[PDB]
Design a protein around this ligand. Structure first.
Ligand SMILES: NC(=O)c1ccc[n+]([C@@H]2O[C@H](COP(=O)([O-])OP(=O)(O)OC[C@H]3O[C@@H](n4cnc5c(N)ncnc54)[C@H](OP(=O)(O)O)[C@@H]3O)[C@@H](O)[C@H]2O)c1
Ligand SMILES: NC(=O)c1ccc[n+]([C@@H]2O[C@H](COP(=O)([O-])OP(=O)(O)OC[C@H]3O[C@@H](n4cnc5c(N)ncnc54)[C@H](OP(=O)(O)O)[C@@H]3O)[C@@H](O)[C@H]2O)c1
Lengths: 10, 145, 326, 326, 145
């Protein structure tokens, strides 16, 4: 989740 | 019935208008949001966006909800295009379980001030100072034993 | 604000009012009044004159071609329009085919004694003819020089967007205008559908009958006055619209609106005409007068327009209550 | 070097000077001088004659149509141009709409007594009309045969590239020329912007007023001489430009330039005219003369041009100092 | 505001002009370098170059600096296209750390003639003859020991 959710949720 | 032409930076896509009228909340499906992208000299909409990413955005309108991702476009680029086309948070969350990254689980609270102080104090050792101090002593009790 | 405005997004600059033509020219009123009518409108800065080939069986154009021939005005200063659709009892003399557009316009330029009209209008949609034949026929008469621009009239908003997508596909000319009905009791089309098209493709609006053919003039309360429009023959559809109780439900709304015109130092026509020009999406308003005193008091409905503030608009809406769903 | 050159990249071959027309024809000078003016220019190899429909309220064309009718020259040997934009006080008689281009050119071919002009110019840009209507109207009058080519005048460099991208999109004809002002004190546009367009799309330049309407002729130092251009009526904008001290700051630069013309065996007009033709990017220079002796001494400004070497150019630049940022 | 058309050997790309005016040093961003590629009969620029490589060069102008590489085009072909379009040595160095190959580290020097002779003589055994002779004896001293 250091590359995935860093630009996923927004 | 009639069709629309969408021009993603030189690449032409043509769907019927009623396909975009399945999802009348997004950018392409709302007739007052896309009116600033129209091109009256060519009778089409011109977006200066990513070329290979719109092939997956178009399939979301045709299939009725399935969000895929091509191999070429990365995660940080395909995620912006969902944000730009305003596909919605239900469409954005389908990019999670398609990719495999599961959503975060919401933890329940004991709806007080005493028990809400002590729940986050031991279960979540990264919260406060002695929360990190309760973890450094919780490793000793098992290790001596 | 502005007296001369563009017809849509074209280059044509029309006055915001234009003396139209119906039952009056060649029919009801005499031709001595009509020359006196047109000189009173031309001298007050109105250049847009409108007619059609069906009006008084093609006699409203002959009496308009004699006026411009006699008065000696420059053709480069006026804007003459003309509608096409009904031009005879024959089967092949009514429609928007390639045969009738070329022959109906060529005969109207013999009645009007001109060499070209400025706008030529399709009077109503035709379901028989395909859209490609009407756009190819209207681009032909433009390229011959029989017209300068072309517009639609009583079309839908979906049919104009279909006649625009043919013109861009086959490299022809799209329409520039649209004549839709718009007064205080008919405001559905021009207030929610046509301003969508102006922001997209740039067609304008040019509204007609702003007094509902004399009903909003306020003369139709105590009954049918003599020498009025409802008292004529063939206008029973008008007379039995006001004599019906829905018209009496409309006369009960012109009593409260009667008082506001005296509050603003005007009369009920000048409130009714200047209410239509309160937007920017309407490029012209086509009046119709029966004598000189009606036209003079209608031309002076420009001074009423700066008084039409948002307070007085929003209470008129509270009287009528027919504001469309934005 | 060459006397006849191509107008841009077109096929039209014009002489490098062309006797224009302004206040002189039909206004200031008499028509006896004008026939004597044009025969003195036609016999020296100048074919390009220029006019417009606004010059002396449309009397500069009638006096030019009588000369070609009387002298009996072949129409296939001359190049007549004409500008369009101002053609009446009416609202619909000024602009670059489809209505005015077709009617303003049709009336000018009745004044000039011709059947076609060779180039028709848009006199200035129009912000009201869209660019598609002007390109479609100029391609219509070409395809009717009322003109052969068309050009722009006082347009920007971004507007010409926009009227070129419409012509290639809709399969129409692009412009071939551009009339921009260019003399010794106004050299910003023709020296850094227009040679970009010639290498890209192939439009030429055809400069006008190369003596700044008589200022660079050197007659405006001691004051206002009689029978000069500044002494006329309506030309107070010119007279109060030279009488202003920025013009006296310009007369203090025509003293040093006065001496170099005597060093090269010429006078100050012939230095000023041949300085404009020193490039290849300018296809013609439109003179303006008031009598025969002015035109004869201006026509002979071709022999000065081989003396205009790089040494004498670079010191003139050191006098003026207004060389644009390349 | 207006747009340009770029024709990479039959494939049409259309971006706005101001996107190319972000980087006014490169080939597409400098209005005197690309003027010899113009085509006045079609109002476009024609390059007879690699087709699938320009989809990545266009994204560098839109994203503002990110240099990717498609799977199809190799390293020796995508590197020439950066050299042809003149994207710059900062753009060329971004092809290093994207690909993973790190830059070479510059070694410091003792700014003399004596110490600069002996620094490259033992630390860099591939320099000279006895530099290779000092390595063949430096393996023995540890191996006997
Ligand atoms: N596109 C189409 O298919 C279509 C269809 C119909 C009409 N039109 C156009 O619409 C234009 C307008 O025609 P219209 O007559 O319906 O417009 P209108 O202005 O609504 O009609 C007003 C009528 O009431 C009377 N009137 C005018 N001013 C008055 C005033 N101050 N006080 C009292 N009465 C007054 C006049 O004669 P009276 O007093 O005798 O009543 C006039 O006939 C026509 O010329 C035609 O070109 C187009
Ligand atoms: N595209 C546009 O919008 C536009 C606008 C304006 C003009 N133009 C064109 O420009 C053309 C040139 O007109 P222009 O008069 O401004 O050019 P110009 O050559 O700069 O004007 C020279 C003026 O000075 C005088 N003169 C000429 N030769 C002289 C000489 N050797 N010695 C002393 N005086 C001399 C003449 O009359 P005086 O002695 O009485 O002064 C003449 O009027 C016009 O014909 C017109 O077609 C185009």
């Amino acid at each position: 989740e250091e590359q995935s959710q860093y630009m996923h949720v927004g | 019935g009639e069709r629309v032409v969408i021009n993603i930076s030189g690449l032409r896509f043509e769907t019927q208008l009623k396909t975009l009228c399945q999802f009348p909340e997004t950018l392409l499906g709302d007739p007052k949001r896309r009116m600033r992208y129209f091109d009256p000299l060519r009778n089409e909409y011109f977006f200066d966006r990513n070329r290979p990413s719109f092939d997956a955005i178009l399939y979301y309108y045709q299939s009725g909800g399935r969000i895929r991702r091509p191999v070429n476009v990365p995660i940080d680029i395909f995620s912006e295009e969902i944000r730009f086309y305003q596909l919605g948070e239900e469409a954005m969350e389908k990019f999670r379980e398609d990719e495999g990254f599961l959503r975060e689980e919401e933890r329940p609270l004991p709806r007080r001030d005493f028990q809400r102080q002590v729940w986050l104090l031991f279960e979540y050792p990264e919260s406060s100072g002695p929360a990190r101090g309760i973890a450094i002593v919780s490793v000793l009790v098992i290790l001596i034993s | 604000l502005q007296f001369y405005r563009n017809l849509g997004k074209s280059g044509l600059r029309v006055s915001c009012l234009g003396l139209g033509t119906w039952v009056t020219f060649g029919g009801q009123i005499t031709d001595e009044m009509a020359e006196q009518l047109m000189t009173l409108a031309y001298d007050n800065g109105i250049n847009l004159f409108d007619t059609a080939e069906v009006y008084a069986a093609g006699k409203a154009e002959v009496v308009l071609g004699n006026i411009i021939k006699k008065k000696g005005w420059r053709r480069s200063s006026l804007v003459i329009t003309t509608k096409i659709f009904w031009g005879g009892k024959a089967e092949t003399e009514r429609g928007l085919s390639r045969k009738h557009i070329i022959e109906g316009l060529k005969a109207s330029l013999e009645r009007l004694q001109l060499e070209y009209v400025d706008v030529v209008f399709a009077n109503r949609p035709d379901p028989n003819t395909p859209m490609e034949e009407t756009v190819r026929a209207m681009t032909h008469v433009i390229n011959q020089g029989m017209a300068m621009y072309w517009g639609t009239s009583r079309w839908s908003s979906m049919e104009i967007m279909e006649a625009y997508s043919v013109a861009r596909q086959f490299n022809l000319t799209p329409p520039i205008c649209e004549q839709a009905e718009y007064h205080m009791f008919q405001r559905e089309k021009v207030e929610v559908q046509l301003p969508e098209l102006f922001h997209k493709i740039g067609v304008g609006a040019m509204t007609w009958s702003p007094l509902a053919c004399g009903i909003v003039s306020g003369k139709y309360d105590s009954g049918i006055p003599p020498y009025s429009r409802a008292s004529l023959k063939g206008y029973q559809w008008l007379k039995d619209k006001i004599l019906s109780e829905e018209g009496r439900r409309q006369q009960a709304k012109l009593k409260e609106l009667q008082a506001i015109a005296e509050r603003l130092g005007c009369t009920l026509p000048q409130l009714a005409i200047a209410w239509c020009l309160r937007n920017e999406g309407v490029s012209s308003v086509l009046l119709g007068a029966s004598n000189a005193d009606q036209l003079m008091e209608n031309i002076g409905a420009i001074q009423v327009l700066p008084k039409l503030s948002s307070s007085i608009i929003h209470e008129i809406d509270s009287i009528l209550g027919n504001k469309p769903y934005s």
